[model samples]
Target: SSVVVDTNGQPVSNGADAYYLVPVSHGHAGLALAKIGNEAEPRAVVLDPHHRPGLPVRFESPLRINIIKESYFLNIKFGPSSSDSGVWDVIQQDPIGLAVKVTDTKSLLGPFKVEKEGEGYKIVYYPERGQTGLDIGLVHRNDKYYLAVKDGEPCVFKIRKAT
Candidate 1:
């Protein structure tokens, strides 16, 4: 059981105030929430090109991630204005593009896990228990990188404690 650590290599405290998901490869961009399309009810988790650092995220566990089983999850709330609960879920309508989005429906939320990759860590999701876990990567669409389950390379990120 490997523990999720921040940029300082400190174990991430459970339900800690906030944390930043910084891409290890893409130094220019960071994880953030944005209004894609016209709908304002739910915001899409995207890689901000401006290095905004985006919104902070909270983990379900205080320390250690069970890589063998999908037990942990991530949550992001956009203040009181947003309608949805900000539970991370993959958009199923688009098969080619499994865009990661927030939803209010509890059943729609996906289980996420952090795994050690190279020098950083990669986020993985188990769509089904028997099937292989999908790596959450960046999908380029409309000149913007959106976080999605990709078949190719997975995005490595350094979980940093938000100040």
Candidate 2:
């Protein structure tokens, strides 16, 4: 087990690349999801698939979200969860041509987008406010999350396997 880490790695505040860890180099966080809930932890912990939170998307605006290059099954969560109306298909951005949302899941919920970029990974467009962004009770899946925005700050939400 890792007892200590030499350098404090980056934390992905965008919220989707909690699985993929293949970084590229350049990044932008304004291209991130605007979090709504707690921001203290920055590490949203999931012990089992049963604990997976429902993806909520606001059925009011056009939106997007970026995803990092990690390798793990990811369960997305949108905002303003209400069974009242539509839904959105999470789109992926291509490193080449203008990435498109091939898998269009309809929901006024979202058009959350994910883009692959640089060294530490990338997150494209999530949504207008489909997140619990940099708050006081932030939570993370892994370690080393990052932000590529102007007010972005590389922070960590420590995760420990529940033993």
Candidate 3:
């Protein structure tokens, strides 16, 4: 088993390629459908964790994240959707034209847009279709990060180095 640790290699928070989207308060955190592998929506929580593998890290937004030992920064893009709602797509600035795709399905759609706002951050989603836009809020709760959507609820998430 691999452990997430810091750059010092002291088992702090390194060797993590992806980050899990977890609810700060809700259970069944954002689990991947493909984790069970029987045709699913790629992401979103319903019953959750059929394989007992843990939460999925397919959704990466702007800010800083590590994937396969490579450090990448993102800029979130929000545009009108063709599928009946707005969507969020994550884009890399230095690389340009690169997109973050769900690791399970290898699909390059639906990435979060993260913006810095004071102590916390702002989020927008780029849906596959439709003009409806969904705005989410992210804040720092002590050490863990929490995210809440539209209704203003907070969910927790953590990031570590890639293994």
Candidate 4:
């Protein structure tokens, strides 16, 4: 099996504990969670301020991602946490302008793959079989950039392993 490498070009082991998803476009912003719009319950994954690395994320075998902080593994919930969505999918049947949330359930965990793109890597989501995977990109909304699987200009990141 092939191994995923970090920003330093070191092999990322299966179940690697902590890593930061640093976007290549916005070198100062890191993937983080925040309550956007009027949503009080679900926290949308957005690019954090002040060059904050946000929370450390975990990688499981077969390329699964779980945003981690303290002892809890934040489930990558699609759409909203209140919705019964099983995996990451296009919101409202639209191909763009959707935000992803993090919950505490394993039922929402989806398949994510990190593939090499140029000098960095891009996170791809296989929503279903026989369907083309969507690239997780950033959507500017309400003065903040939120992570979304969109149709144009996918955001690339350098997976940096935390020390």
Point out the higher-scoring one by TM-score: 1 or 2.
Answer: 1
**Taking the tens digit of each residue's C-alpha lDDT, what string does model 1 give over 19-126?**
787887776677776655556553577888686676666655433542122245543333232344766777753533777887765442336777788778788877
Off by over 4 Å in 1: 35-42, 61-84, 93-96, 107-110
Which candidate comes out best when scored by lDDT? 1
Model 2 agreement with the true structure over 1-163: per-residue lDDT tens digits: 1121111443333332222221122231111232223344322211122222212222122224342223222223333233322222332212211221112244443332232222222223334445422211112323322222211322222221111
- Model 1 has an lDDT value of 0.66
In model 3, the worst 10-residue window by lDDT is: 77-86
- Candidate 2 regions off by >4 Å? 1-111, 126-163
Question: Looking at model 2, which ten-residue stretch has the lowest summed lDDT?
Answer: 93-102
Flag the better candidate by lDDT, 1 or 3.
1
TM-score of every prediction relative to native: 0.77, 0.20, 0.32, 0.72
Worst 10 residues of 4 by lDDT: 66-75
Candidate closer to the true structure by lDDT (higher is better), 2 or 3 = 3
Give candidate 4 regions above 4 Å deviation: 62-96, 107-109
Output the TM-score of candidate 2: 0.20
Model 1: lowest-lDDT 10 consecutive positions: 61-70
Clashing pairs in 4: none
User: Where in model 3 is the C-alpha error above 4 Å?
Assistant: 1-16, 27-30, 34-55, 58-111, 115-123, 126-133, 136-151, 160-162
